[PDB]
Design a binder for this molecule. Structure first.
Ligand SMILES: O=C(O)[C@H]1O[C@H](O[C@@H]2[C@H](O)[C@@H](O)[C@@H](O)O[C@@H]2C(=O)O)[C@H](O)[C@@H](O)[C@H]1O
Ligand SMILES: [Ca+2]
Ligand SMILES: [Ca+2]
Length: 279
């Protein structure tokens, strides 16, 4: 399949070169997989989700995304126009309030929630969790992320936006999950993207168009935007049978475009997510 005039990031993850605008992907499109977006919620009613999104958990008075961030991230995972895995099932878990804030205890509960809740969902092709959030190092937060991964979920987490070594942030610094940095349309590390040995992969993170609340769309930037590219990519590859939850981060690094990014500090991987789709 081919989607013309796609967002640059979708084109990029199906291209060996920057500078193109068509997204190429197997039409299976993540069908039969599930992605949990652990964030501020998801506006499930947005036309772009086509009934494939639903809220399954909130820790606040409402399950509504009153912020926009969670909806944007979900849109990059799985919206029809702006998504990597256009047929995946999206589940929203609202661990962040409408200002984008949340206590680590709530975040940890949300992670253990997905580990259990997947047993209530139909996801024959596998389960992914996308965590576009973080804070200072916390072994408990890292442990929670490692549990979720161990339970059979491909956990993708944002590196952080401090232009610093991600070793000092959580859950970014957990070795067993997939830590995702951000790049821009010219194959530069995004200037805010964390880096370090703990990074596994980069994805598009600067000027990413996706869904927003009120049935709208907008373009924003962050490792929060790169992360769902990778999450959607995992779901897509899992549906195709190329990899599994336990192995998907390794597989994505193995099959990445290598050596193509600029401003990658010595000791950080130079790997850009790529779907290896050959029409
Ligand atoms: O069971 C334990 O406590 C032992 O493994 C632990 O790891 C946690 C899970 O058991 C494991 O499946 C995955 O989720 O990693 C978890 C974590 O990092 O906390 C710990 O390593 C120790 O508690 C160990 O005794
Ligand atoms: Ca720095
Ligand atoms: Ca890792």
């Amino acid at each position: 399949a081919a989607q013309t005039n796609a967002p640059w990031g979708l084109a990029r993850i199906s291209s060996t070169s920057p500078g193109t605008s068509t997204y190429y992907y197997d039409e299976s499109a993540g069908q039969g997989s599930c992605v949990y977006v652990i964030d501020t919620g998801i506006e499930a009613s947005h036309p772009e989700f086509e009934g494939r999104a639903q809220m399954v958990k909130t820790y606040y008075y409402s399950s509504r995304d009153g912020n926009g961030h969670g909806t944007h991230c979900a849109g990059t995972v799985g919206s029809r126009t702006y998504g990597v895995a256009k047929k995946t099932q999206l589940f929203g878990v609202k661990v962040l309030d409408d200002n984008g804030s949340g206590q680590y205890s709530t975040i940890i509960a949300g992670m253990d929630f997905v580990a259990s809740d997947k047993n209530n969902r139909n996801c024959p092709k596998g389960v992914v969790a996308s965590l576009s959030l973080g804070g200072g190092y916390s072994s408990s937060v890292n442990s929670a992320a490692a549990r979720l991964q161990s339970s059979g979920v491909m956990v993708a987490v944002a590196a952080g936006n401090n232009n610093a070594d991600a070793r000092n942030y959580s859950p970014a610094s957990e070795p067993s999950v997939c830590t995702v940095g951000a790049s821009d349309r010219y194959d530069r590390r995004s200037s805010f993207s964390n880096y370090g040995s703990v990074l596994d992969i980069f994805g598009p993170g600067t000027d990413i168009l996706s869904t927003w609340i009120g049935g709208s769309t907008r373009s924003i930037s962050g490792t929060s935007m790169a992360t769902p590219h990778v999450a959607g990519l995992a779901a897509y590859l899992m549906t195709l049978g190329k990899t599994t939850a336990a192995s998907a981060c390794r597989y994505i690094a193995d099959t990445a475009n290598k050596g193509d990014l600029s401003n990658i500090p010595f000791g950080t991987v130079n790997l850009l997510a790529y779907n290896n789709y050959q029409a």
